Amino acid sequence: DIQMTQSPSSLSASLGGRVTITCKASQDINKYLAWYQHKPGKGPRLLIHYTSTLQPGIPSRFSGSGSGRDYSFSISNLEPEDVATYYCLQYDSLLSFGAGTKLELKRADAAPTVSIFPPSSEQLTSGGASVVCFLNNFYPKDINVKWKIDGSERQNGVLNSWTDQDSKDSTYSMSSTLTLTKDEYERHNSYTCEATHKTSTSPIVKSFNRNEC
Amino acid sequence: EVQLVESGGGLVKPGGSLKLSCTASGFAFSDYDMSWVRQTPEKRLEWVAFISNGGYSTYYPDTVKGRFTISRDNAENTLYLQMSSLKSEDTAIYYCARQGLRYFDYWGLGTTLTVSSAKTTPPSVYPLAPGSAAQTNSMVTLGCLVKGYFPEPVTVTWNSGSLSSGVHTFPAVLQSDLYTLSSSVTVPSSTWPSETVTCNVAHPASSTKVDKKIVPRDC
């Protein structure tokens, strides 16, 4: 009926800098545009209505502007607590949101702390074997995790999971799990995960052998 | 003060039916237009249903028209959303919203609906220990693999909540009909296995609790 295309899907920015999100309507919406901030574990917070009127109690660091079809929203002196996802909302005819913008902060590069974990006795008795590898507190977000079994790269059986930006230190973390059957897990000796990240020329390699204990 | 509290979310099979509720307090409920808004897992926000203050006007987007019914009981300060013929795309967190104004201002915190054929299943919980003194210096990372449960969520804590600072619990990932999740904790190595470290996992939908303890050598 009326589409809002919100123009950066994601973005990283430094503390003290400025952030701008554009929101573009399919037809003229007569300045009937509101802006929402959405954090994990809360309902959306109304920031601005009628294109640029600050809701009461909203920092003056937040501003909006536009007319006709094209609209802008800005945060001026970025603070750590502006991390969130933001949405525009037209209310000229019916209601619809832009797809949203995920805002995260820049920090100095951090290298990942890598840890590998063998399958437990409990799980082996069950007939399964997971090898878990944590890549914790790194920056920036982009990281690669590679698994090798006896030196051959392995892609099946791998489940990756990744956190959102940590509120305490602005780092990211990621978890990778290679799940085999017990019989297949016993046919091989070495299990290694390699973390490739721009903080290092050579990947961080962590490895397990069923070779003592 | 203006308060909106949703309830009744849960797990429902494709084709099935569920009725959400939203309880209001802190304002003249019968004076206000009301809406439902959902947040999809791709983090999209979608106007689900609208109802006028007296209940005589109602609006639905085409995605849910003919399947969703919004109603309200003004005597009991309660708003309802009746869903039927539920589809996989209806999986979302459903928000109650008050609409004195054209735009939303007041929201609830949401109730979750999972539409899926997968059956309820408690998780298996496995310890994650370094072992062999393989990699161990100043701090040591321990973990906890939470495997094969449905539906979401689980709650993971460490030492029944005493260890809260060095913790990463990772989002669950679905592997046909079952979720897996992991959780890491970092403590000083002079305190483990010195003192004990145990992860606790509660799965609401199966009412299970499991505390697993992390034991020196996993090798």
CATH number of the domain residue A31 falls in: 2.60.40.10
Domain boundary among A86, A105, A124: A105
Residues A117 and A68 in one domain: no
Residues A21 and A73 in one domain: yes
Adjacency order of strands within the sheet including A144-149: A152-154, A144-149, A190-196, A204-209
Inter-chain touch B145–A89, beta carbons under 8 Å: no
Residues A193 and A129 in one domain: yes
DSSP A30-71: TT-EEEEEE-TTS--EEEEETTTEEPTT--TTEEEEEETTEE
Inter-residue contact B152 to B125 (CB < 8 Å) = no
Identify all chain B residues contacting A159, using CB atoms and an 8 Å cutoff.
173, 175, 180
> Residue for token digits 């951090």?
A110
Q: Please report, as a single letter, which amino acid is at residue B91.
A: T
Residues paired with residue B38 on neighbouring β-strands, in sequence order: B46, B94
Which residues span the domain enclosing A126?
A: 113-209
**Of B160, B206, B159, nearest in space to B179 by CA:** B206
Give me the residue spans of the domains in chain B. 3-115, 124-214
CA distance A97 to A86: 10
Q: Please report, as a single letter, which amino acid is at residue B162.
A: S
**Residues 181 to 210 of A: which have CB under 8 A from any B CB?**
206, 208, 210
Residues A120 and A101 in one domain: no
In sequence order, what are the residues at sequence separation of 6 or more whose Cβ sits closer than 8 angstroms to the Cβ of residue B176?
Answer: none
**Of B123, B122, B121, B126, nearest in space to B212 by CA:** B126
**Of B53, B1, B49, nearest in space to B30 by CA:** B53
> What's phi and psi for A125, nearest 5 deg?
-55, -35
Residues A121 and A63 in one domain: no
CA distance A191 to A79: 42
For residue A203, say if its preceding peptide bond is cis, omega within 30 degrees of 0. no
Residues A101 and A117 in one domain: no
Q: Does domain B124-214 have CATH number 2.60.40.10?
A: yes
- Chain A residue with CA closest to B143: the answer is A117
CA distance B149 to B175: 10
Closest CB to B180: pick one of A36, A119, A177.
A177
Inter-residue contact A96 to A3 (CB < 8 Å) = yes
H or E stretch at A125: helix A121-126
Domain boundary among A63, A89, A105: A105
**Fold matches, B3-115 and B124-214:** yes
Residues A10 and A54 in one domain: yes
> Taking CB atoms and an 8 Å cut-off, how many pairs form between chains A and B?
135
Domain range B3-115, CATH class: mainly beta
Tell me which long-range contacts A201-206 makes (C-beta under 8 A, separation of at least 24).
Answer: A203/A144, A203/A146, A204/A111, A204/A112, A204/A114, A206/A114, A206/A115, A206/A116, A206/A133, A206/B135
CA distance B100 to B110: 19
Number of structural domains chain A divides into:
2
Residues A9 and A99 in one domain: yes
Query: How would you class A207 by CB atoms within 10 Å of its CB: exposed for 0-12, middle for 13-18, buried for 19 or more?
Result: middle
Ramachandran assignment for A66, one of left (phi > 0), alpha (psi -120 to 50 degrees), beta (any other): left
CA distance A160 to A190: 20
How many C-beta atoms lie closer than 10 Å to residue B67's C-beta?
A: 15
CA distance A163 to A34: 29
Residues A94 and A33 in one domain: yes
DSSP reduced 3-state for A124: helix
CA distance B155 to B161: 11
What are the tokens at B136? Answer: 């161990």
What are the tokens at B209? Answer: 């609790």
DSSP code, position B77:
T
DSSP reduced 3-state for B31: helix
CA torsion sign for A120, A123, A124, A125 is positive
Adjacency order of strands within the sheet including B208-213: B155-158, B198-203, B208-213
- Asked if A134 reaches chain B (Cβ–Cβ under 8 Å), the answer is yes
- Chain A residue with CA closest to B133: the answer is A213
> What's phi and psi for A149, nearest 5 deg?
-120, 110
**Of A55, A85, A57, A90, nearest in space to A71 by CA:** A90
CA distance A171 to A155: 26
Give the length of chain A. 213
How many C-beta atoms lie closer than 10 Å to residue B25's C-beta?
A: 11
**Of A213, A212, A207, A199, nearest in space to A178 by CA:** A207
For chain A, the distance separating the N- and C-terminal CA atoms, rounded to the nearest angstrom, is 65
- Asked if A93 reaches chain B (Cβ–Cβ under 8 Å), the answer is no
What are the tokens at B182? Answer: 């992991």
Identify all chain B residues contacting A32, using CB atoms and an 8 Å cutoff.
102
Q: Are strands B198-203 and B155-158 parallel, antiparallel or unpaired?
A: antiparallel
In sequence order, what are the residues at sequence separation of 6 or more whose Cβ sits closer than 8 angstroms to the Cβ of residue B63?
Answer: B46, B89
- This structure was determined by X-ray
Residues A50 and A82 in one domain: yes
CA torsion sign for B203, B89, A166, A130 is positive
Residues A90 and A134 in one domain: no
Inter-chain touch A136–B141, beta carbons under 8 Å: yes
Residues A184 and A134 in one domain: yes
Inter-chain touch B104–A41, beta carbons under 8 Å: no
Inter-residue contact B146 to B183 (CB < 8 Å) = yes
How many C-beta atoms lie closer than 10 Å to residue B166's C-beta?
A: 16
CA distance A160 to B90: 25
CA distance B149 to B118: 10
